[PDB]
Amino acid sequence: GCPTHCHCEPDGRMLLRVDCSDLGLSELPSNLSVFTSYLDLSMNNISQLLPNPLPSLRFLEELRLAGNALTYIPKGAFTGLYSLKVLMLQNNQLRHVPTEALQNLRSLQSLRLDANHISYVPPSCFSGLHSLRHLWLDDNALTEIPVQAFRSLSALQAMTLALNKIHHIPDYAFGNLSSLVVLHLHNNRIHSLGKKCFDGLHSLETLDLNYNNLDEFPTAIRTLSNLKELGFHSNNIRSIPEKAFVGNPSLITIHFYDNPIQFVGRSAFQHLPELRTLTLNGASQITEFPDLTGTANLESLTLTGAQISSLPQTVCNQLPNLQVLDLSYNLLEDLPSFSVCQKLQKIDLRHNEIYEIKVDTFQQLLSLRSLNLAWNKIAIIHPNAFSTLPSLIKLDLSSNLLSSFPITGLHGLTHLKLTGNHALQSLISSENFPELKVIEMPYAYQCCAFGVCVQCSP
Amino acid sequence: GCPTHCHCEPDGRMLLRVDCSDLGLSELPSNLSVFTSYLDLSMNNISQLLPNPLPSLRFLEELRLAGNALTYIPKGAFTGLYSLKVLMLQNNQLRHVPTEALQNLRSLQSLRLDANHISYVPPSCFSGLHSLRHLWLDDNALTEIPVQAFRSLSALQAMTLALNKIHHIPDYAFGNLSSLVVLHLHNNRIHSLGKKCFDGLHSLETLDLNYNNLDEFPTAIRTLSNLKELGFHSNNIRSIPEKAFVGNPSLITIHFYDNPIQFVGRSAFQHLPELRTLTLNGASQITEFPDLTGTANLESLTLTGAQISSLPQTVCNQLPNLQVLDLSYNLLEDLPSFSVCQKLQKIDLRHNEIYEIKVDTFQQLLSLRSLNLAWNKIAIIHPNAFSTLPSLIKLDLSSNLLSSFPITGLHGLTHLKLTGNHALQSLISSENFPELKVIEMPYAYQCCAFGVVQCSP
Amino acid sequence: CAKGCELCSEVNGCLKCSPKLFILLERNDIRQVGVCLPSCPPGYFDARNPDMNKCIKCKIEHCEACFSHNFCTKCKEGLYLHKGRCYPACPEGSSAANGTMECS
Amino acid sequence: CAKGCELCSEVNGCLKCSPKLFILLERNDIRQVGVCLPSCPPGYFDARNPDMNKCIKCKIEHCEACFSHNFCTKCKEGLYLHKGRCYPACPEGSSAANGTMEC
């Protein structure tokens, strides 16, 4: 018995599915018999539910009630819904979590209350939903963390309070809900949090504080051992303090960009054995290379716009498993070995005060593919410096003070860049440089030596 | 009567040319045809000239004696030379300019004494060479400017002392030689010059101090009004002082790159109406934009790697007819009009602290082709900001924290880069954006809106 | 243009959604098309932003439906779901699985 | 390889010259060739450097042979020669042109 206007189908065995989606109903359907296993009412102008709700369909897995602009759910509305598993109450115009519509609804796992105009969450509204694992409370007008009602949600594993207007997170704001694995608080107005907010969830693995207004680094992060992912970008932090992520080993990825970060601790990024990625742009007060003990499996390290002086002798010892390095736009004069730091694939050291290239400084980089040393003060190259880099294909020494050019090894690449090097005038052959297709030269006369009088810009 | 093995030919009317190059004589030929109007012996192991000279040929315009092994030229050797105009004595192993040998050779106009090992020039060696206009004296082992022997050379117009080992330019070192137009002192080791060295030559137009060891800015340049080109690059100068080029208007080109320059004066670049180009990168100590009044015909201005705070409003008033502008990698926050300064074709203001772009900040730039504002802190775009730029074809707004995007004007260009702007999430359509060939996107899903032409997610 | 859609192109379908809805993409033969949904179909998860709300493909191994990323809401059969992730074992801290596939 | 030449490619010609000789370029059908000469031919001028000495074309208006850039040593007929430059006139401070061609 499919209701009028609607679309029906058998679920698994003989249970029935009623689709009453965008049909623009006035009220929910009458009739609509038992055997019904999930029910969709979306975008259909439902003011009040109802003069006659419809409980007693004891087999209903799922009600979807999104886009219906109701203002308030009376209590007994969901009583007979004994097998309710997922209830959706999205983009409706609720102003508060149903004071009592939502309780002792035993078997429900996911409750979706986003895109409403909810502002206050009543205490013990969530009394007796010991199965709720998924909760939406985003795109709403919350003002604080509803600590009260949240306790009874100890089965909660994933929650989102994104896109609200919460500004402060009190201590123990999430006391009991230790089952929580995913917490989402982005696009809010979070300025300050307590020293002991996050101490509740011992099973939290992901955290989202992105697009918010915090001024200082959240030190409450320290207590979340199991945390794997963390994001606090597009905020207003000034600096990462020493031993910031000490309390969170087994962190994989971190997000903090578009934040006016100025100082980063030396040891701030120590002991994160599985950390894979890094990018640090524009940290001026950084005068030191950061310590990376116990963090040896990074693959991409880039540190720019600072005032580093030079690198420690054995710098790369802490750093295997990486492939890309970018230490551009700093005050680098002397250069380390780079030898041990194998498997390197791409390097960028432009705009440094490097006056020289020693022999070993790029020795035995069998994986190195790209080397950029443009805009430096490189007066002199020891000839065998490049003797040992087969995998090298693109090379730049632009805007330098070079007079001659080394020759050993090297032979066989794709890019070679040499402007600003006016002291370079002598020729170079197509032979001992085949497969070269894109080229720059200080003077036009040497470019045609490669047949342009393939690309080559004088 | 052309000498054996050489190849002869008649010049103009009936004159004879004897070419005896690349043959390795022991000595010059004995029985020579006079009638000779120019004569070349180059690369031919000529030790001594000689037991038997051959003057009295009154007419050779040109003797070429390069690449040969002489050590000292005797006095009477070139006497009968009533018509010598150009004598070349290069690639030789001379230790000093011939004492007297090169004296009163009337018609001599160009003298090539380079590629030797001369360190000493006798005073009055160049006595009576009143037709000498051109002098080579490079790649020799000189130690000082030999001012004495130089005075009598008041007809000299072109000279080269490049690549010797002179260290200091004495006071008045070039006293009378006011006829001099080109001076060459590059690839040398000049550490110091006098306050009044260059005041001699009133006709100098070019000066070469490139590749030298100057520590301080040469203030002696001031007296040189007629100077047009100047090069002092690859030295060890630290700063350009205020009113540096005050004394040399009608300067067209200036060269000072590869110099550890830190500070430049504000008014240092005033009044040089014909200057076309300048590039000054890594001048940290400058905190202000330089003044450019009476100098409005710049076509290429680029200023990066400094610490200026902002641009004065009326910047473009001094600055029409420019085409390329580059103030990247610095501390720019607010932006002036840029309207007044039309004819602009290329702009680059990347790596500045620009948090905003106004409506007027780019109004009316029809010659503009490419505008780069990557790596700034620009939170917001006023939509009509780009309403008025037909010719715009290349744009970069990467790493800039935008949320939205205007669409106003512009439509139909060739390059667009907006990565690093993660708060951009809404899509952008193929229509109202034709001719788009290379594109970057913060995220893959909007790249696809263009049929993926190139597009990197 | 379409029901509950603000901007429509004949090439892309829906470009933008009515205030509080979700955009659904699909790349068909190197062509993408947009439709607007009150919520997403199975296999994705619902992501809101003040700029764009989009139904996003769930980048998880052996997962049928999800909440956000790195958290699965329902896993695929023969595989068990432990705290939003999917495994055949599932510790040994002390979990164990009833007549369904939902270890505690 | 060639007279006073140390390094030779059959495709580019001479690539380098003996210590104190000038390398000469010439564009033969969008292929370049290097040759070695004790001095440059007219239309050039001799430019020395500690790295390399090269024969350089004189990028000038109406001149046959020169010393360097912007300064001509010999101009072509019908035009006057003044202080390395060439004009049909030639001022007005006190120059004047006699039976020859050197105002």
Ligand SMILES: *[C@@H]1O[C@H](CO)[C@@H](O[C@@H]2O[C@H](CO)[C@@H](O[C@@H]3O[C@H](CO)[C@@H](O)[C@H](O)[C@@H]3O)[C@H](O)[C@H]2NC(C)=O)[C@H](O)[C@H]1NC(C)=O
């Ligand atoms: C801290 O979190 C726990 C975990 O949810 C909160 O819930 C639990 O409270 C209930 C009482 O409402 C206890 O369950 C009881 O047991 C029988 C079945 O054994 C049940 O039929 C009763 O109706 C009753 O629900 C349960 O022991 C307790 N769980 C734990 C782990 O303590 C607790 O209320 C939260 N409170 C605070 C102050 O942290």
Ligand SMILES: *[C@@H]1O[C@H](CO)[C@@H](O)[C@H](O)[C@H]1NC(C)=O
């Ligand atoms: C929804 O239905 C009610 C009838 O109770 C009507 O008054 C209202 O205007 C409808 N809303 C919309 C948005 O159509």
Ligand SMILES: *[C@@H]1O[C@H](CO)[C@@H](O)[C@H](O)[C@H]1NC(C)=O
């Ligand atoms: C050179 O000239 C002399 C006369 O001055 C003559 O006796 C001699 O045979 C000539 N030798 C040659 C090789 O022409």
Ligand SMILES: *[C@@H]1O[C@H](CO)[C@@H](O)[C@H](O)[C@H]1NC(C)=O
């Ligand atoms: C070079 O000149 C010497 C005299 O200085 C002479 O003995 C020798 O034969 C000459 N060698 C050649 C190859 O001309």
Ligand SMILES: *[C@@H]1O[C@H](CO)[C@@H](O)[C@H](O)[C@H]1NC(C)=O
């Ligand atoms: C050259 O210098 C001498 C002495 O330094 C001076 O008397 C003379 O006027 C100057 N000019 C000429 C043309 O001699």
